Write a protein that binds this ligand. Sequence first.
Ligand SMILES: Cc1cc(-c2cc3c(=O)n(C)cc(-c4cc(C(C)(C)O)ccc4Oc4ccc(F)cc4F)c3o2)cc(C)c1OCCO
Ligand SMILES: Cc1cc(-c2cc3c(=O)n(C)cc(-c4cc(C(C)(C)O)ccc4Oc4ccc(F)cc4F)c3o2)cc(C)c1OCCO
Lengths: 108, 110
Amino acid sequence: SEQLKHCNGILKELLSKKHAAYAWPFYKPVDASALGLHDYHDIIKHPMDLSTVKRKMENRDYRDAQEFAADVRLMFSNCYKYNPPDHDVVAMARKLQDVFEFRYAKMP
Amino acid sequence: KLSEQLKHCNGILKELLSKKHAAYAWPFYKPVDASALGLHDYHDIIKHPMDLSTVKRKMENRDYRDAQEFAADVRLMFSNCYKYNPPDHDVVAMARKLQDVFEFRYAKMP
Ligand SMILES: Cc1cc(-c2cc3c(=O)n(C)cc(-c4cc(C(C)(C)O)ccc4Oc4ccc(F)cc4F)c3o2)cc(C)c1OCCO
Ligand SMILES: Cc1cc(-c2cc3c(=O)n(C)cc(-c4cc(C(C)(C)O)ccc4Oc4ccc(F)cc4F)c3o2)cc(C)c1OCCO
């Protein structure tokens, strides 16, 4: 509950403008419809992005910091699972995760 | 089943401690010898240490009910690295590079 106020702090930093170069594809859920990804939801069974995570933080859905991470990592995993590992979205994901895991480990 | 999950978690561990990734995998092969490295506070800051040999033993001993628990320890390993070290330092770059092989390999796992 005091540690969730930090998890919020992380989400805030994840969405700040510094990282926006590589963070943006995770602000909004994947638009599989528009991108023509007919198979996206057959493979990604539990979509997740940072907006969906924010709603949940607002709605007090995350009990501990562990549940918060679960979803944030799930975002990145969905990216690695669906996408060939060369593609740039993967290399951005990696970039953003690297910041995440930074702040999460630092968290008191 | 659930032991089909773990079969693949074995395949991931194998990859992680293999030939190719050795450049950046080696500081996680065995525990952090704080004593030797002159780290008078490592075990103060890191309450639950973790490394790949430890993971490997647990995988043999069958302490992991599922991949979800396996991942847990691997993530914990990388976490501790990131927790203890400032972000510039080289270990971290390697930690990061190995985590990227894992999440790749883990996320592919049918
Ligand atoms: C065009 C295309 C896109 C994607 C794909 C995967 C994937 C993904 O995992 N995430 C998290 C985000 C995107 C993505 C999302 C969006 C919107 C604004 C619609 O939400 C826009 C572009 C996206 O993908 C990118 C493609 C190339 C990039 F350099 C960067 C991207 F973010 C996204 O796109 C995957 C494939 C295979 C693809 O190519 C279609 C086959 O040629
Ligand atoms: C000497 C020293 C070492 C560490 C440190 C942190 C850290 C770590 O998080 N992991 C996972 C692994 C090592 C590490 C461990 C080992 C052994 C074989 C003893 O287990 C050997 C080297 C290690 O780290 C490196 C030190 C210097 C390098 F140029 C590269 C390293 F991988 C490791 O070393 C951190 C600091 C700040 C440090 O400087 C202490 C005062 O000089």
